Ligand binder design. Structure first.
Ligand SMILES: N#Cc1cc(Cl)cc(Oc2c(Br)ccc(CNC(=O)c3[nH]c(N)nc3Cl)c2F)c1
Ligand SMILES: [Mg+2]
Ligand SMILES: [Mg+2]
Ligand SMILES: [Mg+2]
Lengths: 411, 560
């Protein structure tokens, strides 16, 4: 089991990221987990000559009551990008998103049997903090491929290929894609048969010593062929006020930055003069046709917008109320690659659910996670997100307060 | 002299690509040279340093200093250059213990480690970089060169390597005495047990002997300090803690220096004295004079300072923490952006107090501020106690509900209850969801010339009114707000307003009750006086009726 050498992005040094405060419950969980990992040889205590740090958290597995350690390798991942993307890049299959069902299987346990390059171990340092700074934090580094580092599947790739070879050969129309600690397995089979194949796959994995409804933000399976447009939708009324038309024109105006063809000339003609907002304006036949044409446009996709693999994805999310959230993924603004809605607690719980759902979709569609613009105070998110987080990855995010009418225009 | 620990050394590197320091030694007075020879001879005998030859090419300057009314010489090594070239280490402490987080113990003992750094060995491979040279008289001949065998004073790695050494040394003691609490802080150990006083003193002796087996000396029973412990600006007593005495000077003339020092002391006091305020005192420092310039106290600053003296006239203490009980946090509004809080487990025996002021953003309301305060206290509690408090808040459940469900940001206050402690947090107006029948519709707009900074604000209305006011040294943003303000002034109790300013709309939709902008404050005053206000947006320059006509009105002479 010779290790694979790993270089950082030349000129970059390792991560030095502050450990965020943890509740006692989570500190105790982590101490217990890490003690067992240390015994098994997966990690080792380190001394102060290691200046590096990566935050750790504890989350709940599945719909299970067992604690799981989540390491936030976002920084290390950014600093090792030439390694896992250029050098050992896992290609992403375009057929996955076209399958009727896709099942997500956690294979993170595979990594702990593969030694980590000795010169790289230092960059995987992490700290278990104490309460009230009673004692210095407990410091460890990894001796094995760690869960959450994009390098680990990059390195484990050739092993995963051997593991999956008989299964892929016997099932040539099933698509299997690895992203970070998970496998995504898609078929066009009837669901019973699909699940029978998944159980078969599990047995193959089991033979390599990998002994792998849970979430509210997704079901047993994903159904990506189901995912279809969230059209900007225009209201339908038998009576129109000046205020209603003004609303409509504002919505159409902003719709026209995304969709070509959108016209408002005729609708604005109806607003000539300085009118009372509640005055009823009967639509002339011209305005009616303009409105009809606009509806047709909004039902169809946007000509000319394509994913660019050299560019980051961005996701924006709006709170719509009554447990509803809207979202758009783009790379250049107004050039929406995908829009949608997540529905049905508290605000922070629901938002973490939407984020996990949107990221999963994005993995399936592009093999990349978006950077989220989250409508919430930074500290509130940082305090609470781990209470509800169940994914083994963590997308990039930043915090915005982007009112007002961007919300109106998506529902 | 003293033991050097037989603990394993920490391996230490220079930063990649860099070599050790080679800084020239300056000639020294005969006096200083003689002092250093005596000092280094004794340090060498005690194993702290060793003689080396001209074979080692490294050097750091050395100096000797003896104070003017004193006979004791000291050696000073200037490790600035070695420090610049030494690797980064893990940070020593992410924070310091808050006394309110301490759990009360029957007996507490403080043990300070004597000559801490000098009792820990330095990595053998790194010692060469610590070389220094006592020069000969008038640098005629070769100097006497030495290197360190132990952690030097002022070297970058000493604090961290000392801490990790102490951590390792303590590990087996902790493993065998899980009941005993031992805080590590700098060269100190603070050691608490609930043992009877006889068995506690026995365990302290066992600890001292354990530490001695590892080359670390500590004070014996006789020399050990007794409570209350004066520690980092706190007093720690057997069943309470507080801040050390705060002296608030009486002065004819306050310097900026005096005012800065006062505010610092008041801020320190606020962690246990409830309701301390510093807002008016802080306002005085928002100038640009510095140091010894005299700032006259304003009346509001005099009133604030007087109220603080009253708060501080009699001692106040906090209690320690009991982990088997919930933490309860209460917050009150003190007015003008100031908030104060107390945290207790049994009413009303505070573990600690605090204040929150922060203006987040240009414009805000009390519901947002309260939420921010709650967030701050929540984080502080996780840090000090490892759990979140239950809150008691001066806002009705219905008010909170209306706000969060309608607001566009995700919010989540954890477990809380309304407490009727006026002033209560509320919202002071609300915008209509629908346009108002029988109300005049105003179409407002503002324009400003970027070159001249002149502008116009104005309205037209469906009842045929119009008005334009001229403005100077303004901006497009300000003119758009000026226009809304005009419409509010000139309208009756119910009014519909149509703006093309997303900026204005965003500000007003968030129901601000306070602003850094006087204009926004004037608009809020009007909004509260109205019975019904409907505010709507339209895109600019689309020939939308009403908006088109006010646009032409305010652009005249300003923009084409
Ligand atoms: N100097 C000092 C110092 C600083 C800190 Cl942060 C802690 C410290 O010792 C304590 C420890 Br260990 C544990 C609890 C407390 C709070 N005080 C007591 O429990 C206490 N009990 C008794 N008998 N005296 C004192 Cl003081 C402790 F004070 C001593
Ligand atoms: Mg305008
Ligand atoms: Mg303008
Ligand atoms: Mg305009």
């Amino acid at each position: 089991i010779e290790t694979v050498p790993v270089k950082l992005k030349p000129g970059m040094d390792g991560p030095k990221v502050k450990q965020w405060p943890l509740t006692e419950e989570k500190i105790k969980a982590l101490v217990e987990i890490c003690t067992e990992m240390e015994k098994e040889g997966k990690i080792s205590k380190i001394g102060p000559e290691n200046p590096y740090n990566t935050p750790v958290f504890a989350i709940k597995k599945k719909d299970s009551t067992k604690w799981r350690k989540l390491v936030d390798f976002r920084e290390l991942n950014k600093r090792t990008q030439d390694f896992w993307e250029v050098q050992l890049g896992i290609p992403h299959p375009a057929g996955l998103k076209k399958k009727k069902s896709v099942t997500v299987l956690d294979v993170g346990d595979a990594y702990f049997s593969v030694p980590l390059d000795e010169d790289f171990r230092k960059y995987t340092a992490f700290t278990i903090p104490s309460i009230n700074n009673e004692t210095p934090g407990i410091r460890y580094q990894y001796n094995v491929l760690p869960q959450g580092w994009k390098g680990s599947p990059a390195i484990f790739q050739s092993s995963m290929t051997k593991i999956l070879e008989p299964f892929r050969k016997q099932n040539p129309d099933i698509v299997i894609y690895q992203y970070m600690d998970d496998l995504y397995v898609g078929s066009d089979l009837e669901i019973g048969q699909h699940r029978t194949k998944i159980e078969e796959l599990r047995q193959h994995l089991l033979r390599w010593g990998l002994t792998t409804p849970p979430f509210l933000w997704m079901g047993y399976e994903l159904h990506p062929d189901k995912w279809t447009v969230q059209p900007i939708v225009l209201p339908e009324k038998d009576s129109w006020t000046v205020n209603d038309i003004q609303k409509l024109v504002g919505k159409l105006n902003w719709a026209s930055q995304i969709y070509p063809g959108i016209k408002v000339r005729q609708l604005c003609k109806l607003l000539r003069g300085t009118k009372a907002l509640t005055e009823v304006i009967p639509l002339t036949e011209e305005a009616e046709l303009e409105l009809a044409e606009n509806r047709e446009i909004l039902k169809e996709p946007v000509h000319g917008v394509y994913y660019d693999p050299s560019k980051d994805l961005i996701a924006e999310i709006q709170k719509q109320g009554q447990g509803q959230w809207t979202y758009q993924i783009y790379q250049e603004p107004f050039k929406n690659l995908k829009t949608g809605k997540y529905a049905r607690t508290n605000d922070v719980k629901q938002l973490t659910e939407a984020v996990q759902k949107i990221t999963t979709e994005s993995i399936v569609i592009w093999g990349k996670t978006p950077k989220f613009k989250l409508p919430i105070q930074k500290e509130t998110w940082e305090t609470w997100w781990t209470e509800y987080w169940q994914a083994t990855w963590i997308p990039e995010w930043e915090f915005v307060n982007t009112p007002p009418l961007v919300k109106l225009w998506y529902q | 002299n003293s033991p050097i620990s037989p603990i394993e050394t920490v391996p230490v590197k220079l930063k990649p690509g860099m070599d050790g320091p080679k800084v020239k030694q300056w000639p020294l007075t005969e006096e200083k040279i003689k002092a250093l020879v005596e000092i280094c001879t004794e340090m060498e005998k005690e194993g702290k340093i060793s003689k080396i030859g001209p074979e080692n090419p490294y050097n750091t300057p050395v100096f000797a200093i003896k104070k003017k009314d004193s006979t004791k010489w000291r050696k000073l090594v200037d490790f600035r250059e070695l420090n610049k070239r030494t690797q980064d280490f893990w940070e020593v402490q992410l924070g310091i213990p808050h006394p309110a987080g301490l759990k009360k113990k029957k007996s507490v003992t403080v043990l300070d480690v004597g000559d801490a750094y000098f009792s820990v060995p330095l990595d053998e491979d790194f010692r060469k970089y610590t070389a220094f040279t006592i020069p000969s008289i008038n640098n005629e001949t070769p100097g006497i060169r030495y290197q360190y065998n132990v952690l030097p004073q002022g070297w970058k790695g000493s604090p961290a390597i000392f801490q990790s050494s102490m951590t390792k040394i303590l590990e087996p003691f902790r493993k065998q005495n899980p009941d005993i609490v031992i805080y590590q802080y700098m060269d100190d150990l603070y050691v608490g047990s609930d043992l009877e006083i006889g068995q506690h003193r026995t365990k302290i002796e066992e600890l001292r002997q354990h530490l001695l087996r590892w080359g670390l000396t500590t004070p014996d029973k006789k020399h050990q300090k007794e409570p209350p412990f004066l520690w980092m600006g706190y007093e720690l007593h057997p069943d309470k803690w507080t801040v050390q005495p705060i002296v608030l000077p009486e002065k004819d003339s306050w310097t900026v220096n005096d005012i800065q020092k006062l505010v610092g002391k008041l801020n320190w006091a606020s962690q246990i004295y409830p309701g301390i305020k510093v807002r008016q005192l802080c306002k005085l420092l928002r100038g640009t004079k510095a140091l010894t310039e005299v700032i006259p106290l304003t009346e509001e600053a005099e009133l604030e300072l007087a109220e603080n003296r009253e708060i501080l006239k009699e001692p106040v203490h906090g209690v320690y923490y009991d982990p088997s009980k919930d933490l309860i946090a209460e917050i009150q509004k003190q007015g003008q952006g100031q908030w104060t809080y107390q945290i207790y487990q049994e009413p009303f025996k505070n573990l600690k107090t605090g204040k929150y002021a922060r203006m987040r953003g240009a414009h805000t309301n009390d519901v947002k501020q309260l939420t921010e305060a709650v967030q701050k206290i929540t984080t502080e509690s996780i840090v000090i106690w490892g759990k979140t408090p239950k809150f008691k808040l001066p806002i009705q459940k219905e008010t909170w509900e209306t706000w969060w469900t309608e607001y566009w940001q995700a919010t989540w206050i954890p477990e809380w209850e309304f407490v009727n402690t006026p002033p209560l947090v509320k919202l002071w107006y609300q915008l209509e969801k629908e346009p108002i029948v029988g109300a005049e519709t105003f179409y407002v707009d503002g324009a400003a010339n970027r070159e001249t900074k002149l502008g116009k604000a104005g309205y037209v209305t469906n009842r045929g009114r119009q008005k334009v006011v001229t403005l100077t040294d303004t901006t497009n943003q300000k003119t758009e707000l000026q226009a809304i303000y005009l419409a509010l002034q000139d309208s009756g109790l119910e009014v519909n307003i149509v703006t093309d300013s997303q900026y204005a709309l965003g500000i007003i939709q968030a129901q601000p009750d306070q602003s850094e902008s006087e204009l926004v404050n004037q608009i809020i005053e009007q909004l509260i006086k109205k019975e019904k206000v409907y505010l709507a947006w339209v895109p600019a320059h689309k020939g939308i009726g009403g908006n088109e006509q006010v646009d032409k009105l305010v652009s005249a002479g300003i923009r084409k």
